[PDB]
Design a protein around this ligand. Structure first.
Ligand SMILES: O=S1C=CC(c2ccc(O)cc2Cl)=C1c1ccc(O)cc1Cl
Ligand SMILES: O=S1C=CC(c2ccc(O)cc2Cl)=C1c1ccc(O)cc1Cl
Lengths: 231, 9, 243, 11
């Protein structure tokens, strides 16, 4: 496994190079079916890029195909949400789903139960904003989610890669001039947010399941496959 | 399983 | 003002948390009668309800928790109560591979968890967490830190403008517990790289503990509507705080 | 009238 042989800088640049692009929503208020359709189409197209982003995560390709499927099936909504939260940092009070799709919590009331998920996402973006989260830190957190969120539903290799990313996070903070006490404090603060990102995913997974049997908007086959893996 | 196919490529 | 928690040293933090530990309760389990879905759920409901009473009084003794307003204390316990019940159960079950020690007289395996619909999936996650604690050789001083971190963290992001100092006070105590965890790992002869890695490994488990709590909350809501076994008035309050 | 309130309340 070549992931463990990389340096901290070579881990950062590999994750930065593997970043998926920022996709656009379908061009042109919103109802329930219209907003859910725009979000469904966007999430479905983002999933294709995430799967290719996962292959470029150092150490992910070393896993068997079954383990790659298990990790993506459990973390896919977390990865979509943390990317949405990252894009929305420069837009306080708003969620940047796409450069042409910027929504506030009032627009989240068009869909049932969507305003609760919106407020949790907005709160996470404010937390990233108050902590001055850096893009190098963000790509490490997103890789941690991919490898960690499903590791206990199965493994020594995945934990070795997780320790590798932990070394990379600390290496970034020491590069920024933080003291040893500030390094493990910021490391703890960042990882505790992943507990809430997991919470938003479980709440978001239940909402997508309700949208399925409400049948407001038809879901894609890939989205249904990722959704059915949680029930 | 679409997730399988997208990972093989 | 003049918080007692911010003044505590690392060793004093451990002592206060260890002194606040709730007891390990027993259940009304009779090994004579075999298991039924209503009986086993009644045992787990009766046990969890009595543990909730001890948890609420344990939370009062967590450094910094008493400084929060009553509205914040209610909110933190309402969202973290099942997480705290689960990490305690996982901690009790470390020395019993493949078994969950709900009580010293109630030791269940993944087979007996099948006596309840959907409960088997939650049993396997709790077992995997207990295996992870055993794999890491989790220490009781580290465990009491993680349990207090769950209480303060799990509901801090679910909080208008002036109460930002209350959210800031919680983050100050959270950093205080982080210093305590690092102080523990430094005493056990771990290098700085080992301290950061083990610190990350412990906090990533809290992500899976949140996942088990969310799944457990949906399973408890299912039993409520199934009406097969009645839930206590306190559990119904804590359960309705998530919908 | 929450039970959690009173259990947190009484001293
Ligand atoms: O319920 S959801 C909360 C956030 C989103 C979301 C949508 C698009 C996207 O590119 C990223 C995200 Cl995180 C929700 C959603 C909605 C419909 C749907 O079909 C799929 C999803 Cl994921
Ligand atoms: O669904 S559950 C999975 C674990 C438990 C559990 C039970 C007792 C206890 O002291 C601690 C735990 Cl974590 C379940 C449970 C069951 C019924 C019930 O009424 C409440 C709970 Cl919490």
């Amino acid at each position: 496994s070549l992931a463990l042989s990389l340096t901290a800088d070579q881990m950062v640049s590999a994750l930065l190079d593997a970043e998926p692009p920022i996709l656009y929503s379908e061009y042109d208020p919103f109802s329930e079916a219209s907003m859910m359709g725009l979000l469904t189409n966007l999430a479905d197209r983002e999933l294709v890029h995430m799967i290719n982003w996962a292959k470029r995560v150092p150490g992910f390709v070393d896993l068997t195909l079954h383990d790659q499927v298990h990790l993506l099936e459990c973390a896919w909504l977390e990865i979509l949400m943390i990317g949405l939260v990252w894009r929305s940092m420069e837009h306080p009070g708003k969620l940047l789903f796409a450069p042409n799709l910027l929504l506030d919590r009032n627009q989240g009331k068009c869909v049932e139960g969507m305003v609760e998920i919106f407020d949790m996402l907005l709160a996470t973006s404010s937390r990233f904003r108050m902590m001055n989260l850096q893009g190098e830190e963000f790509v490490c957190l997103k890789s941690i989610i991919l490898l960690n969120s499903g590791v206990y539903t199965f493994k020594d290799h995945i934990h070795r890669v997780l320790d590798k990313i932990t070394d990379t996070l600390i290496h970034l903070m020491a590069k920024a001039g933080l003291t040893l006490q500030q390094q493990h404090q910021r490391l703890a603060q960042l990882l505790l947010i992943l507990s809430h990102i997991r919470h938003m995913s479980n709440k978001g997974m239940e909402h997508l399941y309700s949208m399925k049997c409400k049948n407001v908007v038809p879901l894609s086959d890939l989205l249904l496959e990722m959704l059915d893996a949680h029930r | 399983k679409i997730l399988h196919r997208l990972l093989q490529d």
